Curated annotation (Swiss-Prot), chain B:
It comes from Rattus norvegicus (Rat). Major scaffold postsynaptic density protein which interacts with multiple proteins and complexes to orchestrate the dendritic spine and synapse formation, maturation and maintenance. Interconnects receptors of the postsynaptic membrane including NMDA-type and metabotropic glutamate receptors via complexes with GKAP/PSD-95 and HOMER, respectively, and the actin-based cytoskeleton. Plays a role in the structural and functional organization of the dendritic spine and synaptic junction through the interaction with Arp2/3 and WAVE1 complex as well as the promotion of the F-actin clusters. May homomultimerize via its SAM domain. Interacts with BAIAP2, DBNL and SLC17A7/VGLUT1. Interacts with DLGAP1/GKAP, GRM1/MGLUR1, GRM5/MGLUR5 and LZTS3 C-termini via its PDZ domain. Interacts with ABI1, HOMER1, HOMER2, HOMER3 and CTTN/cortactin SH3 domain. Is part of a complex with DLG4/PSD-95 and DLGAP1/GKAP. Interacts (via PDZ domain) with the GRIA1 subunit of the AMPA receptor (via PDZ-binding motif). Interacts with WASF1 and CYFIP2; the interactions mediate the association of SHANK3 with the WAVE1 complex. It is found in: Cytoplasm; Postsynaptic density; Cell projection, Dendritic spine. The lineage of its organism: Eukaryota, Metazoa, Chordata, Craniata, Vertebrata. It comes from the Eukaryota. Belongs to the SHANK family. This is SH3 and multiple ankyrin repeat domains protein 3. The gene is Shank3. Residues 2-89 form the PDZ domain. The chain holds residues 570 to 664 of 1740 of the full protein.
Length: 6, 89
C-alpha cells in the first residue's frame, strides 16, 4: 500500500 | 461523481491518494482512493471527500492501476486535474 500527498 | 481541479502552481490539489502499489466480491470500485482531503483545499472545493475511489484521471481509466502509475497520471496534467470518483460512503 502507498500514500502520496498531492 | 466529477471533480475538475485547477490549482495554483505552488499549492497542492489537497488530497492524499492511497492504494495498492503496481507490484471474490468487489469491495473497492477501484485500487486508489482518497485517504484524506484537505479541508478547504482545491480538491475539497470540487467536492472530493475521504474515501472517494478514483475511477478516472483526466479521461483515463485507473480502476486497476497501481499507485505510482496513478500518481504519475495525476501529475502529468500539471495544475489541472479531472477526476471521476465513486463514493463508497
Amino acid at each position: 500500500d502507498l500514500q502520496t500527498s498531492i | 461523481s466529477v471533480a475538475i481541479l485547477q490549482k495554483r502552481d505552488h499549492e497542492g490539489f489537497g488530497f492524499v491518494l492511497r492504494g495498492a502499489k503496481a507490484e471474490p466480491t468487489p469491495a473497492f470500485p477501484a485500487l486508489q482512493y482518497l485517504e484524506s482531503v484537505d479541508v478547504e483545499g482545491v480538491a475539497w472545493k470540487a467536492g472530493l471527500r475521504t474515501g472517494d475511489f478514483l475511477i478516472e484521471v483526466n479521461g483515463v481509466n485507473v480502476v486497476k492501476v497501481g499507485h505510482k502509475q496513478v500518481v504519475g497520471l495525476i501529475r502529468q496534467g500539471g495544475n489541472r486535474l479531472v477526476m471521476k470518483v465513486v463514493s463508497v460512503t
